[PDB]
DNA sequence: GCAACCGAATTCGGTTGC
DNA sequence: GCAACCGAATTCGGTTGC
């Protein structure tokens, strides 16, 4: 199993942006890699929220997160995987 | 699998976002969705490309993608899965 | 914690000039 | 067909101020 399992966040841009910095420099030893707050930018598309993506080195590790930390009510969650060499 | 089949094309911001713009384009018809251009915020980071993501209706769709489109020397690519309910 | 707010920086769609 | 360029708009790291 090459997936890497990750959490998309979602909501207003800026409050995203800010869990992001929170996340950042008091949670740092939780997680792998952060994605820069995105939308999808087609016509099209999904839906209006912007988005900021996780990685973690291990299910159990993106589980110990999960305990742990205090998600901002304004932002909605998934969990799941991208191909590992994508990152 | 419920995987999504997708590519995620790196380079100058810039480029990356006309890229975009022009497979919009020209070649609406030829995969899903589309990221704004996205990169990583740590390091942690694995490099400081920006980032772009593209999602497809089927693996044989993100075929007839790859012939058809004309790629820029500027940008390199990669090719994945999300999963997919993250759409 | 949380997000509104700060100015400085970046990215936006769109266009035009190679 | 690319990306430098445009002016307008949005995201950036941080830092209050509740």
Redesign the pocket.
Same mark, same amino acid.
């Given at each position: 199993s090459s997936a890497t399992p990750i959490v998309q966040f979602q909501?207003?841009?800026? /409050?995203? &942006? /800010?869990?992001?910095?929170?996340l950042?420099? &008091?949670h740092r030893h939780l997680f792998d890699l952060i994605?820069? #707050?995105?939308?999808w %930018?087609?016509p099209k598309a999904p839906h209006k929220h %912007?988005i =900021?993506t996780v990685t973690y080195h291990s299910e159990e590790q993106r589980q110990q997160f999960l305990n742990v =930390? &205090? !998600?901002?009510? #304004? !932002?909605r969650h998934k969990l799941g995987f991208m191909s590992m060499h994508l990152l």
């Open positions: 909501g207003e841009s800026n /409050c995203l &942006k /800010c869990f992001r910095y929170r950042n420099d &008091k994605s820069s #707050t995105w939308h %930018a087609s %912007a =900021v =930390v &205090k !998600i901002p009510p #304004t !932002i």
